């Protein structure tokens, strides 16, 4: 416990280069450090969250700062559809003069990068107008970054270290997070929309210096407290309103219009203000559910304990689950990652189809990057959710205190669970691949009318229930006299029905056979990825091939070549396998999103409707067709601003392919090779004089799986991002 | 012809016409790095002299200014820059390897097996003086090539 | 017999391969020059302070004053810039 890994004398005493690698890789697994306590575990996590907040604030602060200092925000806000937004300046002494010219874009005086993050549309929509606005925002976030480090440091001091019992006060944290973290923040955010963002959209300029002397609504708070709330919806912006001007500007602050601001193609600010106010009220009421210090409220433990079906089909129901969850941080993080993963996908699905930010709908590359960025983030987050389920089962699960409850009963019938995921994955793979291959052969043989082309009738019927008329189903909101249509006719349905039946936005795009096939591809990916992950979690404690696996922990290289061979038998390896399947799945979903949109934006959805029912269509009319500008970002005839993406595109192919080395060749080959280099080094004059302080050894078995996975994932992402951005920005859809 | 190293067939090496021949053993025992009883400072000065002088070539003649009039000056600065960074590698190598009291980790025996005093190059101060000579030697060797080529 | 407990240095072959203890064959006055001129760089702690700070300041000076005749990135764009794909 005297060198580098101060938390692991086991590693500090490793005489090989392995010590340095594993010191880095295990630094955040607090539970496995020398002499951790429960208290220290919580306290380190708690301070680590403050450091993570500090980095988040610091990062946002720089984005603000770099846009204000080197971007064209002030020109963008005066002409948002004719100015490429600048991310930051570039200063690279390797550039030749033709690279300096090509990257000089926007209104800038030097080479710059164009921002595909959407922050200009975001900041503009919420009220930011001037570079100064951005500067003081950055300074404020810098202050928040600093404060977050102060509290982190503070709560690692003995006077301020919180006790385990405090970290386990679940009822109090829930009440505060629901009503305060969620509710008051949403209420306050509606306050910002009403006081700053909405006046900004109506050509007024409300800032800290003047916001006390200007009314958000001519009638003040009178209507709020008298109950005459309709007054706040009275005089909404015209459908001819020009954003950031008073032309057609109304006075409503809280509306329920549905649909889009026709010029900006994004949600009405007065709708978003009403939304944040409404959910705030719900969070604020909901945050009064649990008992704290006042003699009212619920006990979560008692609630769980009561929920046991009389009749016994769930054994002891939920008994014991409060302390199983409240005493296991991997259980908690599993639920956190699982939930955040669902809503990260929700964000991606809802933001492309119901954009909130003015002039982001027509910034095609931004919409492509934003959807792709969150679906990959969501995928990784989902794999972590199961990985920490597995870790929960090994480190924290107490069979006896969960005896016969719903959690133990999952382990009892793991073979039923796993073998049905297996069945569902087999069904979806055989038939989805079988159907695409059939269609390909039909195309190959000049007989496309012999394709199997199943109509996505169930989803089309759902779009019709939502009011889309494309399919003639005439259901619910597509009907003429459904009570559903009658109830909302007076409110949100005029603006919604308009948006859903406009076929040049992204709200509920028209779908045919091509959308059917790739949705079953997607269901294949979801089912197979969860198969790996569920099988991984449920066998983590033990299988017939290794019935004592729990005694070996989450990650171990294997259990040796006996009993027939046991490579990749740990729960950590099931995670490792699942990442490939998650990257596959998100690949399929993002390919689909992009190709559906690029043919939409180009004005010929029929290119997708026809070429997508067979796989040669995807290879040729999606990947090959859309690569031509990207791979010419530099050629024997010069280069252009697509040069970076052409280079990163190949960089991504290179990192990915290097991953294959760590994945295919395994350790023993390389350990023997390194030995001949140890010999050679100790027998080479002059070089004899120099000696290593760490014995060179081949990487560990597990290490190589990780290094390979990381290379594979990194090249996967960089290849697709380069293609996505170049193909979309080289033409603007 | 090809004998076991020093007659011991179980040491992990061989004695071949390349490892130990009369001309090989002479030239290798005459390099400044194998002068085990001479000052390590003066070793590094000759080492830096020879290397910094060699580094001027590739930087100037292949650099991004190789075909300009600013060529000789830039690659020479790039040559001295390479000497500066290497002197940090030599320094941190010593700070990590040798302590202020440890004896020389050099062989204390000879090819015939008699006891001599180990090469004090393999010590904290003996290293500190060697890398100090390399830095002084490498900077002046860069300048000496810069002197003969473009002055 | 290549094994000896009293001489573990020869049993393991801890021999100096090419180390010659022959005295210094240099110009002994040039030695007094090299020993007194290269002397201040012979403290590793101070030399590390020197190389780190001297190189950092020198690297900063050369990059701060680099002319446009040397760096295209400081010379800057000369052509008029072309528009964006959608009249951007």
């Amino acid at each position: 416990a005297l060198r580098f890994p101060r938390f692991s004398q086991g590693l500090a005493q490793d005489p090989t280069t392995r010590r340095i690698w594993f010191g880095i890789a295990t630094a955040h697994d607090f539970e496995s450090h020398d002499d951790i306590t429960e208290g220290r575990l919580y306290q380190n996590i708690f301070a680590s969250h403050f450091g993570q907040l500090a980095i988040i604030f610091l990062w946002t602060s720089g984005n603000l700062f770099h846009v204000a200092w080197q971007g064209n925000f002030e020109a963008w806000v005066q002409d948002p559809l004719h100015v490429r937004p600048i991310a930051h300046a570039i200063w690279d002494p390797h550039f030749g003069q033709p690279a300096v010219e090509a990257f000089t874009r926007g209104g800038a005086l030097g080479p710059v990068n164009i921002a595909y993050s959407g922050v200009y549309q975001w900041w503009y929509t919420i009220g930011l107008r001037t570079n100064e606005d951005l500067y003081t925002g950055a300074i404020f976030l810098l202050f928040l970054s600093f404060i977050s480090l102060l509290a982190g440091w503070l709560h690692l001091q003995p006077k301020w270290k919180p006790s385990v019992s405090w970290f386990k006060n679940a009822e109090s944290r829930l009440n505060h997070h629901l009503s305060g973290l969620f509710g008051v923040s949403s209420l306050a955010w509606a306050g910002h929309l009403v006081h700053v963002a909405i006046p900004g959209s109506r050509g007024e300029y409300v800032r800290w210096n003047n916001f006390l002397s200007v009314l958000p609504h001519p009638q003040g708070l009178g209507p709020l407290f008298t109950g005459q709330w309709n007054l706040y919806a009275q005089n909404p912006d015209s459908s001819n309103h020009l954003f950031s001007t008073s032309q057609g500007a109304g006075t409503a602050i809280l509306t329920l219009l549905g649909g889009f601001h026709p010029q900006t193609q994004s949600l009405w600010l007065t709708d978003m203000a009403h939304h944040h106010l409404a959910i705030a009220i719900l969070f604020l009421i909901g945050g009064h559910m649990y008992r704290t210090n006042f003699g009212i409220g619920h006990s979560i433990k008692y609630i769980l304990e009561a929920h046991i079906p009389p009749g016994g089909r769930l054994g002891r129901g939920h008994k014991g689950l409060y302390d199983t969850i409240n005493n296991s941080i991997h259980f908690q993080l599993g639920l956190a990652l699982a939930s955040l993963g669902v809503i990260t996908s929700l964000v991606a699905q809802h933001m492309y189809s119901l954009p909130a930010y003015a002039f982001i709908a027509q910034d095609f590359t931004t919409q492509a990057a934003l959807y792709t960025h969150h679906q990959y983030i969501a995928g990784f987050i989902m794999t972590g959710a199961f990985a920490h389920g597995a870790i929960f089962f090994i480190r924290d699960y107490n069979p006896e205190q969960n005896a016969d409850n719903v959690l133990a009963r999952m382990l009892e019938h793991k073979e039923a669970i796993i073998s049905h995921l297996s069945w569902a994955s087999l069904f979806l793979g055989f038939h989805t691949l079988g159907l695409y291959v059939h269609n390909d052969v039909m195309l190959a043989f000049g007989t496309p009318e012999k394709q199997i082309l199943i109509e996505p009738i169930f989803a089309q019927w759902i779009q019709s229930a939502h009011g889309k008329t494309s399919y003639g189903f005439d259901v619910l909101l597509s009907s003429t006299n459904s009570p559903a249509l009658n109830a909302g006719r007076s409110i949100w349905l005029p603006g919604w029905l308009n948006a859903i039946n406009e076929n040049s936005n992204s709200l509920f795009l028209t779908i045919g056979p091509g959308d059917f096939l790739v949705h079953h591809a997607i269901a294949l990916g979801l089912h197979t990825t969860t198969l790996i992950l569920v099988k991984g979690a449920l066998d983590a404690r033990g299988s017939k091939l290794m019935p004592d696996k729990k005694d070996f922990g989450y990650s171990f290289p294997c259990d040796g070549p006996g009993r027939g061979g046991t490579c990749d038998i740990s729960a950590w390896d099931a995670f490792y396998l699942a990442v490939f399947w998650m990257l596959n799945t998100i690949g399929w979903v993002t390919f689909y999103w992009h190709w559906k949109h690029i043919t939409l934006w180009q004005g010929n959805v029929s290119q997708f409707n026809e070429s997508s029912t067979y796989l040669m269509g995807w290879l040729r009319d999606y990947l090959w067709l859309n690569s031509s500008q990207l791979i010419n970002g530099y050629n024997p005839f010069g280069m252009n601003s697509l040069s970076v993406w052409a280079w990163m595109f190949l960089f991504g192919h290179l990192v990915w392919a290097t991953g294959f080395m760590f994945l295919i060749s395994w350790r023993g080959y390389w350990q023997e090779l390194i030995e001949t280099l140890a010999w050679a080094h100790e027998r080479t004059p002059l070089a004899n004089l120099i000696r290593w302080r760490d014995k060179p050894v081949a990487l560990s078995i597990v290490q190589a799986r990780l290094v390979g996975l990381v290379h594979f994932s990194v090249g996967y992402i960089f290849t697709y991002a380069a293609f996505l951005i170049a193909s979309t920005s080289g033409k603007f859809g | 012809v090809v004998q076991p190293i020093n007659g011991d067939p179980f040491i992990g090496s061989l004695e071949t016409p390349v490892t130990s021949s009369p001309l090989v053993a002479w030239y290798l025992s005459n390099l400044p790095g194998y002068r085990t009883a001479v000052n390590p400072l003066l070793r590094g000065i000759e080492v830096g002299l020879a290397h910094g002088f060699l580094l001027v070539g590739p930087f100037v003649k292949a650099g991004p200014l190789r075909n300009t009039e600013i060529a000789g000056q830039a690659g020479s600065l790039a040559a001295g820059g390479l000497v500066v960074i290497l002197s940090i590698c030599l320094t941190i190598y010593g700070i990590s390897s040798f302590n202020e009291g440890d004896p020389s980790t050099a062989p204390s025996l000879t090819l015939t097996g008699r006891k001599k005093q180990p090469d004090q190059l393999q010590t904290a101060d003996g290293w500190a003086k060697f890398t100090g000579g390399f830095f002084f030697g490498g900077i002046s060797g860069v300048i000496w090539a810069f002197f003969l080529l473009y002055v | 017999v290549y094994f000896d407990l009293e001489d573990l240095g020869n049993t393991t072959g801890q021999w100096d391969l090419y180390g010659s203890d022959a005295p210094s064959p240099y110009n002994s006055l040039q030695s007094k020059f090299f020993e007194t001129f290269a002397a201040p760089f012979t403290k590793r702690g101070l030399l590390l302070k020197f190389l780190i700070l001297g190189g950092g300041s020198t690297l900063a000076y050369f990059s701060a004053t680099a002319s446009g005749d040397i760096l295209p990135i400081k010379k800057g764009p000369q052509l008029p810039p072309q528009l964006g794909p959608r009249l951007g």
């Binding site: 005297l2 580098f4 200063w91 | - | 780190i52 690297l59 900063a60 701060a64």
Partner: peptide
Amino acid sequence: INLPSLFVPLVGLLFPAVAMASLFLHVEKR
């Protein structure tokens, strides 16, 4: 340009060299 020509070589050459040298001595210490 008057500041990028200062910070880009500082964060991309000096800081990594100072960091790599610092970490090399901590990891090698005993």
